[PDB]
Amino acid sequence: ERYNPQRWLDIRGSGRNFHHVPFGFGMRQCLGRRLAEAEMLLLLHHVLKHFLVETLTQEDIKMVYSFILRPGTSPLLTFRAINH
Amino acid sequence: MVDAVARDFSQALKKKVLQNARGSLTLDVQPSIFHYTIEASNLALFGERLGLVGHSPSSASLNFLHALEVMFKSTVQLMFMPRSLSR
Amino acid sequence: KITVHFINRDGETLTTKGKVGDSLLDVVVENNLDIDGFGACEGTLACSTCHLIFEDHIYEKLDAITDEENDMLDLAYGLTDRSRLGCQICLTKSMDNMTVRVPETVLPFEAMPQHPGNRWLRLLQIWREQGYEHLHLEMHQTFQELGPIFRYNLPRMVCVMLPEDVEKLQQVDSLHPCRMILEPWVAYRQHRGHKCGVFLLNGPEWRFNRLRLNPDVLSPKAVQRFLPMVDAVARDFSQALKKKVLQNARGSLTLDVQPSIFHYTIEASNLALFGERLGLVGHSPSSASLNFLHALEVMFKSTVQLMFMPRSLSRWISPKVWKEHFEAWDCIFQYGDNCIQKIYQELAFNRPQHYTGIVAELLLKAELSLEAIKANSMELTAGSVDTTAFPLLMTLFELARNPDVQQILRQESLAAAASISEHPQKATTELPLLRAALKETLRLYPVGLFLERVVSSDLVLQNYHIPAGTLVQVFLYSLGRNAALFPRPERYNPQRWLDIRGSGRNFHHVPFGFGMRQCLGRRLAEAEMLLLLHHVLKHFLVETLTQEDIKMVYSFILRPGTSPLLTFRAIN
Numbered sequence: 001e002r003y004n005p006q007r008w009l010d011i012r013g014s015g016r017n018f019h020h021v022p023f024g025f026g027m028r029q030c031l032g033r034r035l036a037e038a039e040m041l042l043l044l045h046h047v048l049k050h051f052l053v054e055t056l057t058q059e060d061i062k063m064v065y066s067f068i069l070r071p072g073t074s075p076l077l078t079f080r081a082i083n084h
Numbered sequence: 085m086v087d088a089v090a091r092d093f094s095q096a097l098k099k100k101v102l103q104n105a106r107g108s109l110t111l112d113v114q115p116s117i118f119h120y121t122i123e124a125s126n127l128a129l130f131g132e133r134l135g136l137v138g139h140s141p142s143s144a145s146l147n148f149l150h151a152l153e154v155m156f157k158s159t160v161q162l163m164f165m166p167r168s169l170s171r
Numbered sequence: 172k173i174t175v176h177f178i179n180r181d182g183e184t185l186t187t188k189g190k191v192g193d194s195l196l197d198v199v200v201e202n203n204l205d206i207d208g209f210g211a212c213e214g215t216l217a218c219s220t221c222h223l224i225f226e227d228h229i230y231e232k233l234d235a236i237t238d239e240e241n242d243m244l245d246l247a248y249g250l251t252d253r254s255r256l257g258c259q260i261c262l263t264k265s266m267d268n269m270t271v272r273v274p275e276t277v278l279p280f281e282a283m284p285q286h287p288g289n290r291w292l293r294l295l296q297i298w299r300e301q302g303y304e305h306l307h308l309e310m311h312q313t314f315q316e317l318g319p320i321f322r323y324n325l326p327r328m329v330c331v332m333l334p335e336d337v338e339k340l341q342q343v344d345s346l347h348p349c350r351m352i353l354e355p356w357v358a359y360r361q362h363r364g365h366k367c368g369v370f371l372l373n374g375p376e377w378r379f380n381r382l383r384l385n386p387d388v389l390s391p392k393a394v395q396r397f398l399p400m401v402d403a404v405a406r407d408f409s410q411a412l413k414k415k416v417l418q419n420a421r422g423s424l425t426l427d428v429q430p431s432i433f434h435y436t437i438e439a440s441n442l443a444l445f446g447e448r449l450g451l452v453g454h455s456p457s458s459a460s461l462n463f464l465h466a467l468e469v470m471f472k473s474t475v476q477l478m479f480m481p482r483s484l485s486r487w488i489s490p491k492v493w494k495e496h497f498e499a500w501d502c503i504f505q506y507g508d509n510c511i512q513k514i515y516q517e518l519a520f521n522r523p524q525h526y527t528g529i530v531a532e533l534l535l536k537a538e539l540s541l542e543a544i545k546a547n548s549m550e551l552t553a554g555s556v557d558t559t560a561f562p563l564l565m566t567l568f569e570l571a572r573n574p575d576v577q578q579i580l581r582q583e584s585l586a587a588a589a590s591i592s593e594h595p596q597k598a599t600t601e602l603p604l605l606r607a608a609l610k611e612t613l614r615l616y617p618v619g620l621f622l623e624r625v626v627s628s629d630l631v632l633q634n635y636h637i638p639a640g641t642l643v644q645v646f647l648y649s650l651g652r653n654a655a656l657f658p659r660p661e662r663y664n665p666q667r668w669l670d671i672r673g674s675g676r677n678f679h680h681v682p683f684g685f686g687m688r689q690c691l692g693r694r695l696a697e698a699e700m701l702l703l704l705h706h707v708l709k710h711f712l713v714e715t716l717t718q719e720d721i722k723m724v725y726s727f728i729l730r731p732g733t734s735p736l737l738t739f740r741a742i743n
């Protein structure tokens with residue numbers, strides 16, 4: 001339950017197979033795989049170089065399965081601009 | 085093309101952030117994010133700029149999102165039944 | 172150090188000393204002198220209990236009186252041609268052995284004129300008409316038949332209408348002034364686990380809250396902190412109007428401005444309070460904006476349907492109105508709670524080094540429980556819309572009706588324009604005639620209709636003994652139209668308040684109240700109103716052909732039922 005992205009560069013080290021599979025495998029693996037990555041990566045990139053993101057609601061978010069797994073809570077997030 | 089949408093998203097957010105005394109904007113961002121993906125998607129796919137980022141949602145935008153929610157919802161009610169029953 | 176002699180009400184000369192540069196409020200509280208009730212609001216010009224009368228040779232060489240002090244002195248009993256407010260007077264070298272001095276100041280109750288009407292007939296009238304929009308006209312007719320004083324057969328309750336009576340009523344102002352309690356609103360607070368705010372509090376909880384609010388909501392120091400922010404909203408309002416005006420062939424835009432004004436006050440309020448810019452001025456209304464305004468209308472409406480009944484009756488007669496009432500409050504508290512969960516989260520992660528609004532201070536100071544900041548933050552977010560915007564319409568309207576007065580308020584504004592554009596704070600001081608025009612609108616159209624006080628001791632007004640525990644009500648409508656104090660009362664003449672200020676006539680301008688329960692938004696309202704009209708006069712001409720009088724409705728507050736069609740012609 002610890003959020004630690006570095007673990008995926010350490011998993012790349014000691015070669016371990018099939019650890020990152022949310023898009024699938026084989027040739028029925030998600031066709032939007034790299035379009036999703038594109039949309040997500042750049043938005044967050046452009047948000048990090050201008051804003052600080054904070055929140056008081058650090059309880060876990062209850063998630064609901066309604067075909068896809070999604071959050072039932074949407075948290076109240078602050079975007080504080082950086083100026084230096 | 086996605087870069088342009090994500091840039092326009094942050095510059096839109098920054099404009100409004102910087103109008104507030106504390107240089108901050110706290111909000112529920114789920115709506116603005118969903119409209120980002122509709123814009124980045126529709127541009128990458130059809131080359132069209134819908135003008136949903138930075139501006140207000142449109143009628144077509146919110147009807148589309150609702151229909152998705154209903155479709156997922158109504159799917160779990162019919163997936164586990166054969167259509168012989170759900171009929 | 173300097174010696175100063177104080178003549179008390181009992182006649183005795185107290186002598187003590189203070190240091191130069193000290194306020195004589197400091198001299199009184201730092202020596203525990205026995206001047207009962209002196210300095211109630213701890214030096215934030217929110218009471219007139221530091222009133223002191225000076226010697227002619229000392230008073231003459233004191234600083235000029237500010238409008239903020241003069242408006243306070245106008246609500247001070249026993250006013251004199253040599254009286255000042257101790258909180259605003261710092262001791263100086265020449266006041267050694269000064270002598271200041273503090274002021275001093277029948278048929279039975281049942282022999283007073285009675286209101287013919289019957290509590291229950293009226294109660295049932297409201298049951299069906301769902302309101303009593305005409306009540307202010309009933310009471311005017313009453314005073315014009317029974318005289319300047321009558322009682323209502325109910326408990327005891329007397330309705331008055333003269334400055335004489337308001338002056339006495341403030342002398343009786345206790346340490347815990349008691350306004351009567353609105354159960355429909357409090358029932359809502361009890362039902363949701365919420366704390367009542369200042370508007371609905373009495374006793375020590377009231378005094379506790381108020382003394383931790385006046386500093387950042389009412390002090391001239393706080394007014395100077397948020398006045399520049401209101402300037403930005405009023406500027407953005409005129410430049411927005413001018414853009415659209417100048418697109419039309421004849422450099423004009425005629426419209427119903429009531430919507431745009433209401434959205435101005437929501438913006439100026441939410442910015443002054445929560446430092447947030449909502450972007451409602453210049454752009455279209457939002458869903459949250461119009462839902463908030465409707466819920467206010469419904470809440471006022473449903474209040475008059477439940478105020479005159481005890482809860483014992485309205486429980487089963489109009490339970491639907493209770494559902495209607497709470498769902499209004501439900502929408503209101505949703506709007507307000509989110510402005511505060513917005514800022515509580517912000518402030519948690521960084522305390523700013525500059526001014527970020529009124530509530531930011533209160534939260535930072537943390538002299539109140541958050542549940543008590545939440546409750547006052549609500550009262551302020553909800554009280555700062557209808558009460559501020561209706562007076563602001565009627566002012567525009569009367570300036571369109573009185574072209575003479577307009578062109579004089581314009582000269583004043585243009586004259587002071589550059590002075591104010593450089594430092595907005597100066598609007599307080601550089602626009603005296605405009606501020607007199609706000610007294611003229613609230614005289615004729617007082618959105619606050621009554622001042623109410625449960626007295627704490629036997630007093631007497633207009634020679635009718637008034638026993639303790641009695642409700643007294645100041646009907647400001649009939650007050651403002653008494654030709655005896657206001658020559659030609661229906662005439663709109665802002666200069667009249669300058670005439671009045673020379674002579675020691677008292678309690679003439681009382682729509683915000685008196686004492687320490689006078690309106691906490693008093694100087695925020697005045698800020699929002701003054702600058703909008705200032706910025707509108709230096710760019711636009713305001714005209715209208717609908718110069719009939721506007722019929723006004725009673726829905727807990729006194730508001731217009733007509734909104735007039737006003738023209739804004741740009742000047743070039």
Ligand code: HEM
Pocket residue numbers: 022023024025026027028029030031032033035036
């Ligand atoms: C985080 C984002 C996404 C996740 C986690 C995800 C997940 C998946 C998964 C698990 C599959 C099935 C893999 C399999 O059966 O082997 C799949 C298939 C598919 N996804 Fe996604 N997907 C995402 C985004 C997208 C996007 C953005 C699109 C379209 C632009 C998309 C369109 C598709 C399609 C068309 C298939 C069918 C592939 C096939 O049957 O060959 N997905 N996705």
Ligand code: HEM
Pocket residue numbers: 350369370371381550551552554555556558559562613617618619621622623682683684685686687688689690691692693695696
């Ligand atoms: C023209 C505008 C306004 C008028 C005529 C007005 C009138 C009044 C009156 C007559 C009272 C009661 C005075 C008394 O009982 O002695 C009052 C109290 C109050 N008003 Fe207003 N008001 C105005 C604007 C505002 C605004 C803008 C706010 C908030 C931002 C506000 C918030 C309050 C509060 C919190 C109280 C309770 C004061 C207490 O109980 O100590 N009012 N107002």
Ligand SMILES: N#Cc1ccc([C@H]2CCCc3cncn32)cc1
Pocket residue numbers: 370549550551553554555558619690727728
């Ligand atoms: N909560 C609350 C609350 C909302 C609005 C008001 C407004 C309307 C009620 C009469 C009045 C006098 N001064 C301000 N107000 C007062 C309190």
Ligand code: FES
Pocket residue numbers: 196209210211212213214215216217218219220221243256257258259
């Ligand atoms: S104490 Fe001086 S005015 Fe309130």
